[PDB]
Amino acid sequence: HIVLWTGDQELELQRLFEEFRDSDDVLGHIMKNITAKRSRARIVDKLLALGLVAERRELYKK
């Protein structure tokens, strides 16, 4: 794996998150669509660090 994000990798993460956030497996759809190898837990932490979600439970809303 890698653990840092280039500017373009961050923008890609955001586009995929925006698309898949209402699915039942947002992280799975993100991971299927990025080329870099990354762990699920690190991607979750990056979504939090960017403020795309404010806390973990927002990744799976009712």
Author numbering: 885 to 946
Could you give the paper's own sentences about this structure?
The FPC comprises four main proteins—Timeless, Tipin, Claspin and AND‐1—that are conserved from yeast to mammals. Our findings indicate that Timeless contributes to the ability of the replisome to sense replication‐hindering G4 formation and ensures the prompt resolution of these structures by DDX11 to maintain processive DNA synthesis.
We used X‐ray diffraction and NMR spectroscopy to investigate experimentally the structure and dynamics of the newly discovered Timeless domain. The 1.15 Å crystal structure of amino acids 885–947 (C‐term), corresponding to a single myb‐like fold, confirmed the presence of a three‐helix bundle characteristic of the homeodomain superfamily of DNA‐binding proteins, extended by the presence of a fourth C‐terminal alpha helix unique to the Timeless domain. Superposition of the DBD C‐term onto the structurally homologous domains of the telomeric protein TRF1 (Court et al, 2005) and bacterial cell cycle regulator GcrA (Wu et al, 2018) in complex with their dsDNA substrates shows that, if the DBD were to adopt a similar mode of dsDNA binding, the fourth helix of both its N‐term and C‐term repeats would likely lead to a steric clash with the phosphate backbone of the DNA. While Timeless DBD binds to both ss‐ and dsDNA, it binds with ~ 10‐fold greater affinity to a defined G4 DNA sequence.
